[PDB]
Amino acid sequence: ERPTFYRQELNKTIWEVPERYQNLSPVGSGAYGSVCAAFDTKTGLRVAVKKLSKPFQSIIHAKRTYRELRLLKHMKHENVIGLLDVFTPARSLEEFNDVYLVTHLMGADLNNIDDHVQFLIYQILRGLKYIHSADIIHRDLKPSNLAVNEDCELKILDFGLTDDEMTGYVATRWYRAPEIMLNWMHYNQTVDIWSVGCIMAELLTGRTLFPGTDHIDQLKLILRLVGTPGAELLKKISSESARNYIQSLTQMPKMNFANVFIGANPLAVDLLEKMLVLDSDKRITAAQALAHAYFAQYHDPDDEPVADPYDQSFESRDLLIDEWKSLTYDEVISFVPPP
């Protein structure tokens, strides 16, 4: 039942959207495409519309388009960005060239912003429990992909999705777990818990926890706080080069977190000590952290949902452009809006 589309030149490209979406206005860059704010006249919601940039340009692009669509279609949680709508002006698979994604328009990210800290981190962990239960890892959680509305209600964006933008004194690398940053090992879900620790610390102090000037300076800032690796962790580092470099470092003990986070709620300090553990096997999980005394005022086990199973078998699959495009098209066509 095809809606009527109209055309409008915005982000140096012609946007072609259903009539329901009015007053389009550029917000900026999103993940793999440009974003416009819009009023959805059907739902009464202020929405963000993302037009993907050349979504089937290559195999890597076609697969990444499929991947983002699948991830967004899966996520049905208050604290996680999901899909309100997806459309294409194309009438068939043959003319399918553009994908538009629609979600809630948020008010500010965590850059643009103790009881407040409890509430914000609670929601991140609530959302992360849900994402992690589906065997999804965010991989790049940072204040800029965490957004709030007016009531400080939070959603996580850009989950599940280069060398130069990770280089130097840049916020793009400051929230990354040491094992990802230096590619130590095949990493788990608590890389995101490391990120939550970095963000929580920053909300509490108003300062970046590990503002490294490069990968190596950042590692040193990390190890000064949490200590140098012991034998047990060194064994778990499969990268022989990386393991060898670690062993060149002067050994350092873990610092006292109460002397770093002076004046902070001791339950906040305790939680930070459990999130910011060097060995990712021993880091607190999202489900465990929600039960921590710090969130006593917000914690409700009956209101902390988990996700339906997420089939990501497509990830290990190699297909042609036209095959990823066809799969993408099927997912667009089969979309059913939320209530």
Ligand SMILES: C[C@H](O)CNc1nc(Oc2ccc(F)cc2F)nc2[nH]nc(-c3ccccc3Cl)c12
């Ligand atoms: C962080 C990101 O790379 C840029 N900001 C935003 N991006 C997106 O991307 C989309 C994701 C899924 C969709 F279905 C549609 C989108 F536009 N939605 C958004 N909805 N609201 C925002 C937003 C708006 C103003 C300030 C902060 C944010 Cl996160 C926002």
